[PDB]
Amino acid sequence: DTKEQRILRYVQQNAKPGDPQSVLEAIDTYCTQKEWAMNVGDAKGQIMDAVIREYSPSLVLELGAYCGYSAVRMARLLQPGARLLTMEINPDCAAITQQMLNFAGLQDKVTILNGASQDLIPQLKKKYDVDTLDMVFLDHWKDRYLPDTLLLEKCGLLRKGTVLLADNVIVPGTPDFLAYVRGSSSFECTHYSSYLEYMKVVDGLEKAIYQGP
Ligand SMILES: Nc1ncnc2c1ncn2[C@@H]1O[C@H](CSCC[C@H](N)C(=O)O)[C@@H](O)[C@H]1O
Ligand SMILES: Cc1ncccc1-c1cc(O)c2nc[nH]c(=O)c2c1
Ligand SMILES: [Cl-]
Ligand SMILES: [Mg+2]
């Protein structure tokens, strides 16, 4: 088996079906005690939780699903009727994420989109019936953060007040994205210093609120 299959099995055997918090705790435990994995983690996750509660977004887009940790984390805080779309290029991980969501009982709130973000983003309006996004969580691959931000704007998916929340802006680091949003009059940016998941290594989230053209 893979690490990702081992994480899912650990949740299935150490969490309670229908209890998102137990799912997050099981993943955290496994990845602290057994095998590190690139989930956003509890330290940065607590910052995400505070942001989701502040904005109560109706429609969230996540870029990069992995095993579903962040999708569980966000979807558990959504209001009835609110929705999350999560894009995942690796089909093995999409299959893990679906099973994780099902186990957590959050499958009604979350849709997996299979493919590369750069291919799926241009389909969101016509194929997926999206108007604009309330929040975007960028956590796929560092070199896609800036191009996909620009693509979201081109496609008409951002509105005044859309919240972009980007993981890993320190480690691995996203210097072109940070320089761009922090220099742009079209974003209002805040940095939330934290720690790399499961490690005593500094990292951070960036929040960049879109202002309009
Ligand atoms: N262009 C792209 N589009 C979609 N998914 C991508 C991508 N490039 C990488 N990925 C996916 O992005 C993921 C990064 S890890 C995501 C972790 C998750 N947000 C969490 O916190 O639980 C991987 O599963 C990888 O396959
Ligand atoms: C894998 C890794 N090694 C050392 C340091 C950091 C990482 C790391 C951590 C993350 O949170 C990631 N999130 C999304 N996508 C990634 O590529 C990614 C990589
Ligand atoms: Cl952590
Ligand atoms: Mg990350």
Side-chain angles (χ1 to χ4, degrees), residues 27 38-41 48 62-72 74 86-91 93-94 97 113-120 137-142 144 148 167-168 197:
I27 295 168
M38 65 180 165
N39 312 122
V40 66
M48 297 175 60
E62 167 173 272
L63 306 180
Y66 191 48
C67 297
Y69 180 95
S70 60
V72 168
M74 293 190 282
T86 185
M87 296 179 173
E88 174 52 60
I89 199 172
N90 181 294
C93 289
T97 293
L113 300 178
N114 298 285
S117 54
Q118 64 268 36
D119 297 327
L120 291 166
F137 181 50
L138 299 87
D139 193 24
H140 53 337
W141 176 242
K142 56 180 192 173
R144 289 239 60 83
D148 289 348
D167 191 30
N168 304 119
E197 51 263 34

Short mmCIF file of all heavy atoms in Angstrom, two decimals, residues 27 38-41 48 62-72 74 86-91 93-94 97 113-120 137-142 144 148 167-168 197, ligand 1:
data_model
loop_
_atom_site.label_atom_id
_atom_site.label_comp_id
_atom_site.label_asym_id
_atom_site.label_seq_id
_atom_site.Cartn_x
_atom_site.Cartn_y
_atom_site.Cartn_z
N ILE A 27 -6.02 11.77 11.67
CA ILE A 27 -5.00 12.08 10.67
C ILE A 27 -3.80 12.77 11.35
O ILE A 27 -2.65 12.43 11.08
CB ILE A 27 -5.58 12.93 9.53
CG1 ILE A 27 -6.62 12.16 8.78
CG2 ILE A 27 -4.43 13.40 8.61
CD1 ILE A 27 -7.47 12.98 7.80
N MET A 38 1.65 15.80 3.82
CA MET A 38 1.43 17.22 3.50
C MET A 38 0.03 17.75 3.67
O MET A 38 -0.44 18.58 2.89
CB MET A 38 1.98 17.49 2.10
CG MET A 38 1.27 16.78 0.96
SD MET A 38 2.02 17.19 -0.65
CE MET A 38 1.29 15.91 -1.64
N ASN A 39 -0.64 17.29 4.72
CA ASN A 39 -1.92 17.92 5.10
C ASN A 39 -1.64 19.31 5.68
O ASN A 39 -0.59 19.50 6.30
CB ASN A 39 -2.59 17.10 6.19
CG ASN A 39 -2.64 15.62 5.89
OD1 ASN A 39 -2.08 14.79 6.74
ND2 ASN A 39 -3.20 15.21 4.84
N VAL A 40 -2.62 20.21 5.65
CA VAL A 40 -2.32 21.55 6.13
C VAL A 40 -2.01 21.51 7.64
O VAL A 40 -1.29 22.35 8.17
CB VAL A 40 -3.43 22.56 5.77
CG1 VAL A 40 -4.74 22.24 6.47
CG2 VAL A 40 -3.01 24.01 6.03
N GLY A 41 -2.58 20.52 8.36
CA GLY A 41 -2.24 20.28 9.74
C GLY A 41 -3.06 21.13 10.73
O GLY A 41 -3.84 21.99 10.37
N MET A 48 -7.01 28.63 9.50
CA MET A 48 -8.08 28.41 8.51
C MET A 48 -9.43 28.42 9.15
O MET A 48 -10.37 29.02 8.63
CB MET A 48 -7.90 27.09 7.78
CG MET A 48 -6.66 27.06 7.01
SD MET A 48 -6.44 25.41 6.30
CE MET A 48 -7.92 25.34 5.32
N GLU A 62 -11.22 24.69 -3.41
CA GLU A 62 -9.91 24.23 -2.96
C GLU A 62 -9.12 23.71 -4.13
O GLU A 62 -9.65 22.93 -4.97
CB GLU A 62 -10.08 23.09 -1.94
CG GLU A 62 -8.82 22.32 -1.62
CD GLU A 62 -9.07 21.36 -0.49
OE1 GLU A 62 -8.90 21.85 0.66
OE2 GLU A 62 -9.43 20.17 -0.71
N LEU A 63 -7.85 24.11 -4.20
CA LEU A 63 -6.91 23.59 -5.17
C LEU A 63 -5.94 22.69 -4.43
O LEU A 63 -5.10 23.12 -3.68
CB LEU A 63 -6.17 24.75 -5.85
CG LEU A 63 -7.07 25.84 -6.48
CD1 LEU A 63 -6.22 26.95 -7.13
CD2 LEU A 63 -8.06 25.25 -7.47
N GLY A 64 -6.09 21.36 -4.69
CA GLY A 64 -5.27 20.32 -4.06
C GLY A 64 -5.97 19.66 -2.90
O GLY A 64 -6.07 20.25 -1.82
N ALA A 65 -6.48 18.44 -3.12
CA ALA A 65 -7.24 17.73 -2.12
C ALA A 65 -6.45 16.75 -1.26
O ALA A 65 -6.63 16.63 -0.06
CB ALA A 65 -8.45 16.94 -2.77
N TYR A 66 -5.54 16.00 -1.92
CA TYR A 66 -4.66 14.99 -1.28
C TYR A 66 -5.51 13.87 -0.66
O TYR A 66 -6.11 13.10 -1.42
CB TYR A 66 -3.60 15.65 -0.40
CG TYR A 66 -2.53 14.73 0.08
CD1 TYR A 66 -1.88 13.88 -0.80
CD2 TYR A 66 -2.13 14.69 1.40
CE1 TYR A 66 -0.90 13.01 -0.35
CE2 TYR A 66 -1.16 13.83 1.88
CZ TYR A 66 -0.52 12.99 0.97
OH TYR A 66 0.47 12.14 1.43
N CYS A 67 -5.56 13.78 0.64
CA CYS A 67 -6.34 12.76 1.34
C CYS A 67 -7.67 13.29 1.91
O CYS A 67 -8.42 12.53 2.53
CB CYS A 67 -5.55 12.13 2.46
SG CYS A 67 -4.08 11.23 1.93
N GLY A 68 -7.96 14.57 1.70
CA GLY A 68 -9.19 15.19 2.18
C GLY A 68 -9.14 15.87 3.49
O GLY A 68 -10.18 16.32 3.96
N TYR A 69 -7.97 16.01 4.10
CA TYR A 69 -7.89 16.67 5.41
C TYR A 69 -8.43 18.08 5.41
O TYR A 69 -9.31 18.43 6.21
CB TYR A 69 -6.43 16.64 5.92
CG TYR A 69 -6.22 17.29 7.27
CD1 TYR A 69 -6.23 16.54 8.44
CD2 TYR A 69 -5.98 18.65 7.38
CE1 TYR A 69 -6.02 17.14 9.68
CE2 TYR A 69 -5.75 19.25 8.63
CZ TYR A 69 -5.74 18.48 9.76
OH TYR A 69 -5.54 19.12 10.96
N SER A 70 -7.92 18.92 4.52
CA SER A 70 -8.40 20.30 4.47
C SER A 70 -9.86 20.40 4.05
O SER A 70 -10.58 21.27 4.52
CB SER A 70 -7.48 21.18 3.64
OG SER A 70 -7.39 20.71 2.30
N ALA A 71 -10.30 19.50 3.17
CA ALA A 71 -11.70 19.51 2.75
C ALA A 71 -12.62 19.20 3.93
O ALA A 71 -13.65 19.85 4.12
CB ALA A 71 -11.95 18.54 1.61
N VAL A 72 -12.23 18.22 4.75
CA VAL A 72 -12.96 17.92 5.98
C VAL A 72 -12.92 19.13 6.92
O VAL A 72 -13.94 19.51 7.52
CB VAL A 72 -12.41 16.64 6.64
CG1 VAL A 72 -12.98 16.48 8.11
CG2 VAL A 72 -12.76 15.40 5.79
N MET A 74 -12.55 22.35 6.34
CA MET A 74 -13.38 23.46 5.89
C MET A 74 -14.85 23.07 5.87
O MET A 74 -15.69 23.83 6.39
CB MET A 74 -12.91 23.99 4.52
CG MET A 74 -11.58 24.62 4.56
SD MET A 74 -11.12 25.49 3.05
CE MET A 74 -10.67 24.10 2.06
N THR A 86 -13.45 20.84 -4.74
CA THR A 86 -12.04 20.56 -4.57
C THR A 86 -11.46 19.90 -5.80
O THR A 86 -12.04 18.95 -6.34
CB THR A 86 -11.68 19.80 -3.30
OG1 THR A 86 -10.27 19.71 -3.24
CG2 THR A 86 -12.33 18.38 -3.26
N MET A 87 -10.40 20.46 -6.32
CA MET A 87 -9.74 19.98 -7.55
C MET A 87 -8.49 19.18 -7.21
O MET A 87 -7.60 19.63 -6.44
CB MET A 87 -9.34 21.19 -8.43
CG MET A 87 -10.57 21.98 -8.92
SD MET A 87 -10.09 23.39 -9.91
CE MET A 87 -11.72 23.96 -10.49
N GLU A 88 -8.38 18.00 -7.86
CA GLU A 88 -7.30 17.08 -7.52
C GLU A 88 -6.84 16.37 -8.82
O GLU A 88 -7.66 15.67 -9.47
CB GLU A 88 -7.77 16.06 -6.49
CG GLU A 88 -6.71 14.97 -6.21
CD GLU A 88 -5.33 15.54 -5.83
OE1 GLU A 88 -5.23 16.29 -4.81
OE2 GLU A 88 -4.38 15.21 -6.56
N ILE A 89 -5.58 16.54 -9.18
CA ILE A 89 -5.05 15.98 -10.38
C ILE A 89 -4.72 14.49 -10.30
O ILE A 89 -4.65 13.83 -11.32
CB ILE A 89 -3.77 16.81 -10.80
CG1 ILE A 89 -3.36 16.66 -12.27
CG2 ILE A 89 -2.58 16.49 -9.88
CD1 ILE A 89 -2.27 17.60 -12.68
N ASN A 90 -4.46 13.97 -9.11
CA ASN A 90 -4.05 12.58 -8.95
C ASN A 90 -5.27 11.72 -8.62
O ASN A 90 -5.91 11.91 -7.61
CB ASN A 90 -3.01 12.49 -7.84
CG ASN A 90 -2.49 11.07 -7.62
OD1 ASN A 90 -3.19 10.19 -7.21
ND2 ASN A 90 -1.31 10.87 -7.92
N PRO A 91 -5.58 10.74 -9.50
CA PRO A 91 -6.80 10.01 -9.30
C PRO A 91 -6.78 9.11 -8.04
O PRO A 91 -7.82 8.87 -7.44
CB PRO A 91 -6.94 9.17 -10.58
CG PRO A 91 -5.69 9.13 -11.09
CD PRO A 91 -4.93 10.38 -10.77
N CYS A 93 -5.43 9.89 -5.20
CA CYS A 93 -5.78 10.78 -4.11
C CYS A 93 -7.23 11.22 -4.17
O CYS A 93 -7.88 11.33 -3.12
CB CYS A 93 -4.80 11.96 -4.04
SG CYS A 93 -3.16 11.50 -3.50
N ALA A 94 -7.79 11.46 -5.36
CA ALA A 94 -9.21 11.75 -5.46
C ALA A 94 -10.05 10.61 -4.85
O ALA A 94 -11.00 10.90 -4.13
CB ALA A 94 -9.62 12.03 -6.90
N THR A 97 -9.75 10.83 -1.06
CA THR A 97 -10.52 11.97 -0.58
C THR A 97 -12.01 11.67 -0.56
O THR A 97 -12.70 12.02 0.42
CB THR A 97 -10.20 13.22 -1.44
OG1 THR A 97 -8.85 13.63 -1.22
CG2 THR A 97 -11.09 14.39 -1.11
N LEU A 113 -13.53 17.50 -8.19
CA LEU A 113 -13.33 17.78 -9.64
C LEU A 113 -11.96 17.15 -10.01
O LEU A 113 -10.91 17.47 -9.41
CB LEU A 113 -13.39 19.26 -9.97
CG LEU A 113 -14.72 19.97 -9.65
CD1 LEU A 113 -14.71 21.48 -9.97
CD2 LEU A 113 -15.92 19.25 -10.28
N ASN A 114 -12.01 16.24 -10.98
CA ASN A 114 -10.83 15.45 -11.38
C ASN A 114 -10.11 16.10 -12.50
O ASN A 114 -10.67 16.26 -13.61
CB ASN A 114 -11.26 14.03 -11.73
CG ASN A 114 -11.85 13.33 -10.56
OD1 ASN A 114 -11.08 12.95 -9.68
ND2 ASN A 114 -13.19 13.19 -10.50
N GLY A 115 -8.88 16.44 -12.23
CA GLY A 115 -8.07 17.02 -13.22
C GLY A 115 -7.21 18.05 -12.69
O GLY A 115 -7.13 18.29 -11.47
N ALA A 116 -6.52 18.67 -13.59
CA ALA A 116 -5.60 19.77 -13.28
C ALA A 116 -6.43 21.04 -13.09
O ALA A 116 -7.26 21.37 -13.94
CB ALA A 116 -4.59 19.95 -14.42
N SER A 117 -6.08 21.82 -12.08
CA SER A 117 -6.74 23.12 -11.82
C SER A 117 -6.78 24.01 -13.06
O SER A 117 -7.78 24.62 -13.36
CB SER A 117 -6.06 23.82 -10.66
OG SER A 117 -4.67 23.92 -10.91
N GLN A 118 -5.68 24.06 -13.78
CA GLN A 118 -5.62 24.95 -14.97
C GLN A 118 -6.57 24.51 -16.07
O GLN A 118 -7.03 25.36 -16.86
CB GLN A 118 -4.18 25.09 -15.43
CG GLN A 118 -3.48 23.80 -15.93
CD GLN A 118 -2.71 23.04 -14.79
OE1 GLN A 118 -3.14 22.98 -13.63
NE2 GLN A 118 -1.58 22.46 -15.15
N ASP A 119 -6.95 23.23 -16.10
CA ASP A 119 -7.92 22.74 -17.06
C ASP A 119 -9.37 22.88 -16.55
O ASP A 119 -10.30 23.05 -17.33
CB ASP A 119 -7.63 21.29 -17.42
CG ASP A 119 -6.28 21.11 -18.12
OD1 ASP A 119 -5.81 22.00 -18.87
OD2 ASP A 119 -5.65 20.05 -17.89
N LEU A 120 -9.56 22.73 -15.26
CA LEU A 120 -10.91 22.72 -14.67
C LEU A 120 -11.42 24.15 -14.41
O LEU A 120 -12.62 24.39 -14.53
CB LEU A 120 -10.88 21.93 -13.36
CG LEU A 120 -10.65 20.45 -13.51
CD1 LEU A 120 -10.31 19.87 -12.15
CD2 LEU A 120 -11.82 19.70 -14.15
N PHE A 137 -8.95 28.24 -1.48
CA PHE A 137 -7.80 27.73 -0.71
C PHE A 137 -6.80 27.18 -1.71
O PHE A 137 -7.08 26.19 -2.40
CB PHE A 137 -8.23 26.65 0.28
CG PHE A 137 -7.09 26.10 1.13
CD1 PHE A 137 -6.22 26.94 1.81
CD2 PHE A 137 -6.92 24.72 1.28
CE1 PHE A 137 -5.17 26.40 2.58
CE2 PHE A 137 -5.90 24.23 2.08
CZ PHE A 137 -5.04 25.05 2.71
N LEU A 138 -5.64 27.82 -1.79
CA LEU A 138 -4.56 27.41 -2.74
C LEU A 138 -3.59 26.53 -1.95
O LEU A 138 -2.92 26.99 -1.03
CB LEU A 138 -3.82 28.62 -3.34
CG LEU A 138 -4.65 29.59 -4.17
CD1 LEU A 138 -5.30 30.68 -3.34
CD2 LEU A 138 -3.82 30.12 -5.34
N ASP A 139 -3.49 25.26 -2.35
CA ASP A 139 -2.64 24.31 -1.63
C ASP A 139 -2.29 23.12 -2.51
O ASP A 139 -2.27 21.97 -2.06
CB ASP A 139 -3.35 23.81 -0.37
CG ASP A 139 -2.46 23.08 0.60
OD1 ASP A 139 -1.24 23.29 0.62
OD2 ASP A 139 -3.03 22.31 1.43
N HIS A 140 -1.98 23.40 -3.78
CA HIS A 140 -1.70 22.34 -4.78
C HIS A 140 -0.21 22.28 -5.07
O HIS A 140 0.49 21.38 -4.57
CB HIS A 140 -2.59 22.46 -6.00
CG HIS A 140 -2.66 23.78 -6.71
ND1 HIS A 140 -2.35 24.96 -6.08
CD2 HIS A 140 -3.09 24.05 -7.96
CE1 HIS A 140 -2.61 25.93 -6.96
NE2 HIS A 140 -3.07 25.42 -8.10
N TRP A 141 0.32 23.21 -5.84
CA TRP A 141 1.73 23.22 -6.19
C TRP A 141 2.16 24.68 -6.33
O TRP A 141 1.51 25.46 -7.01
CB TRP A 141 2.01 22.46 -7.49
CG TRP A 141 3.41 22.52 -7.94
CD1 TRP A 141 3.86 23.06 -9.10
CD2 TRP A 141 4.58 22.10 -7.19
NE1 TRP A 141 5.25 22.95 -9.14
CE2 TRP A 141 5.71 22.41 -7.97
CE3 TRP A 141 4.79 21.54 -5.91
CZ2 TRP A 141 7.04 22.14 -7.55
CZ3 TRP A 141 6.12 21.30 -5.49
CH2 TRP A 141 7.21 21.61 -6.31
N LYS A 142 3.27 25.01 -5.65
CA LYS A 142 3.74 26.36 -5.52
C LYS A 142 3.78 27.14 -6.85
O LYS A 142 3.37 28.30 -6.89
CB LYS A 142 5.11 26.36 -4.87
CG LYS A 142 6.15 25.51 -5.58
CD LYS A 142 7.44 25.58 -4.84
CE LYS A 142 8.55 24.99 -5.66
NZ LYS A 142 9.86 25.20 -5.02
N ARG A 144 1.96 26.91 -9.45
CA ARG A 144 0.65 27.19 -10.00
C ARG A 144 -0.11 28.30 -9.29
O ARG A 144 -1.16 28.73 -9.76
CB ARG A 144 -0.23 25.94 -9.97
CG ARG A 144 0.18 24.82 -10.97
CD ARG A 144 -0.94 24.52 -11.91
NE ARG A 144 -1.36 25.69 -12.73
CZ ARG A 144 -0.77 26.08 -13.85
NH1 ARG A 144 0.31 25.44 -14.34
NH2 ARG A 144 -1.28 27.11 -14.50
N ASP A 148 -2.73 30.36 -11.60
CA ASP A 148 -4.14 30.04 -11.37
C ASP A 148 -4.91 31.24 -10.78
O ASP A 148 -6.08 31.39 -11.11
CB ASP A 148 -4.33 28.80 -10.47
CG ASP A 148 -3.94 27.49 -11.19
OD1 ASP A 148 -3.75 27.49 -12.39
OD2 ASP A 148 -3.92 26.45 -10.48
N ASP A 167 -1.67 28.32 1.30
CA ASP A 167 -0.79 27.56 2.19
C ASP A 167 0.63 27.66 1.67
O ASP A 167 0.90 27.83 0.47
CB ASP A 167 -1.23 26.09 2.30
CG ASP A 167 -0.50 25.35 3.42
OD1 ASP A 167 -0.16 26.03 4.40
OD2 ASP A 167 -0.34 24.09 3.32
N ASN A 168 1.60 27.47 2.57
CA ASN A 168 3.01 27.17 2.18
C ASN A 168 3.70 28.33 1.52
O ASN A 168 4.62 28.16 0.71
CB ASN A 168 3.14 25.95 1.28
CG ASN A 168 2.54 24.70 1.87
OD1 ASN A 168 1.60 24.12 1.28
ND2 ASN A 168 3.00 24.29 3.04
N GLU A 197 3.12 21.84 8.87
CA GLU A 197 2.36 20.78 9.49
C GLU A 197 3.30 19.77 10.15
O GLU A 197 4.27 19.28 9.57
CB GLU A 197 1.47 20.10 8.45
CG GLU A 197 2.19 19.63 7.16
CD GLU A 197 2.06 20.63 5.99
OE1 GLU A 197 2.03 21.87 6.24
OE2 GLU A 197 2.05 20.15 4.85
N1 LIG B 1 -2.38 21.50 -11.02
C1 LIG B 1 -2.97 20.77 -10.05
N2 LIG B 1 -4.32 20.69 -10.01
C2 LIG B 1 -4.90 19.94 -9.06
N3 LIG B 1 -4.33 19.24 -8.07
C3 LIG B 1 -3.01 19.37 -8.07
C4 LIG B 1 -2.25 20.10 -9.03
N4 LIG B 1 -0.92 20.02 -8.74
C5 LIG B 1 -0.84 19.25 -7.67
N5 LIG B 1 -2.10 18.85 -7.24
C6 LIG B 1 -2.44 18.09 -6.02
O1 LIG B 1 -2.26 19.00 -4.93
C7 LIG B 1 -2.14 18.22 -3.72
C8 LIG B 1 -1.21 18.96 -2.78
S1 LIG B 1 -1.34 18.44 -1.06
C9 LIG B 1 -2.99 19.10 -0.67
C10 LIG B 1 -3.21 18.97 0.85
C11 LIG B 1 -4.66 19.29 1.26
N6 LIG B 1 -5.07 20.67 0.80
C12 LIG B 1 -4.77 19.23 2.78
O2 LIG B 1 -4.39 20.21 3.42
O3 LIG B 1 -5.29 18.20 3.27
C13 LIG B 1 -1.74 16.79 -4.15
O4 LIG B 1 -2.72 15.81 -3.86
C14 LIG B 1 -1.49 16.97 -5.68
O5 LIG B 1 -1.76 15.78 -6.44
#
